[PDB]
């Protein structure tokens with residue numbers, strides 16, 4: 001008796017799903033390949049639509065205390081500093097969308113999310129190598145020679161998803177012609193230029209950009225992440241070190257505020273971004289996918305983790321409707337209730353002009369996931 005869910009991947013999507021599903025009364029364990037838990041030294045942006053999901057988890061208030069609450073998102077021209085858009089966030093967002101827009105330290109958010117999972121149910125050092133849906137249950141084999149069995153398996157295992165591979169076979173090669181540079185800035189370097197350093201700003205030019213925001217309400221730590229054309233990635237790491245000289249050449253011509261940020265860094269890392277992504281895969285048999293395993297996308301709108309967390313919330317609602325004994329109905333309802341919004345996000349990402357002009361972002365931030373009728 002008593003049915004079991006195995007989740008592969010303890011990233012933001014897998015850890016959200018584990019929390020929501022356990023809080024709903026399901027029996028859930030999580031299997032993560034990393035040998036240890038790492039707090040990523042990076043920021044992340046979380047819109048009101050996802051703060052409403054952290055609310056269900058009991059984490060919204062804590063995240064509000066930890067994060068920065070920008071009053072606006074500014075899009076600015078990279079060369080001139082002209083204001084291309086002034087998107088109201090802050091108290092306007094709280095009233096209009098029903099929750100805060102925050103920017104926050106991603107590693108600390110991630111730790112808080114894993115700490116909401118029942119102790120004894122998250123297993124590190126478990127890299128899935130083989131999975132077989134035997135028809136009435138699924139067996140999972142890990143690289144350390146252990147295994148586990150479950151009634152359904154959630155593929156929360158990211159763009160390199162092994163669940164996706166077991167279903168579709170080996171994915172065609174995808175190359176990388178662009179990178180994201182990442183840096184955290186603190187210090188007198190930050191204090192010296194605090195008057196010109198706005199809380200949430202995207203600096204744009206013809207073929208590249210730099211996004212910048214604070215990670216905490218103290219505004220003592222300032223983060224940037226870029227998107228920049230780059231030669232094909234052939235390094236073994238998921239990242240490599242970059243340098244100020246690299247960044248200053250890539251951002252030649254940008255406004256003095258951006259040059260000040262580059263000069264203020266101590267350590268920059270570079271991350272490969274894929275040129276292409278496959279079409280969504282939602283479920284097959286006893287396997288269901290969420291987040292970057294399901295609908296990998298270019299990072300143009302920076303809503304990927306938010307979409308993974310929305311997936312987790314909607315999947316939980318659908319399993320609450322059907323129970324685990326009727327997983328095929330749940331998995332069908334999940335896809336039916338997510339695919340159009342995922343497709344709108346895809347189409348707007350393709351245009352790559354999100355908040356470049358003074359547009360109304362309500363369709364993203366005002367979305368009411370728990371209000372949607374599953375039908």
Ligand SMILES: Cc1cc2nc3c(=O)[nH]c(=O)nc-3n(C[C@H](O)[C@H](O)[C@H](O)COP(=O)(O)OP(=O)(O)OC[C@H]3O[C@@H](n4cnc5c(N)ncnc54)[C@H](O)[C@@H]3O)c2cc1C
Pocket residue numbers: 008009010011012013014031032033034043044045046126127128129156157158159160161162180225273290291292293299302303304305306307308
């Ligand atoms: C430059 C950039 C900026 C971004 N900014 C934002 C932002 O501000 N806001 C936002 O919402 N999103 C943002 N995103 C998108 C976001 O990072 C991703 O969409 C999100 O991480 C997807 O979460 P996930 O849980 O689906 O996958 P992941 O975060 O990739 O997690 C997958 C997990 O599965 C594990 N795993 C993989 N293979 C296996 C295996 N075989 N066995 C076991 N475990 C395995 C991995 O180790 C990992 O822990 C950005 C992305 C980029 C590239």
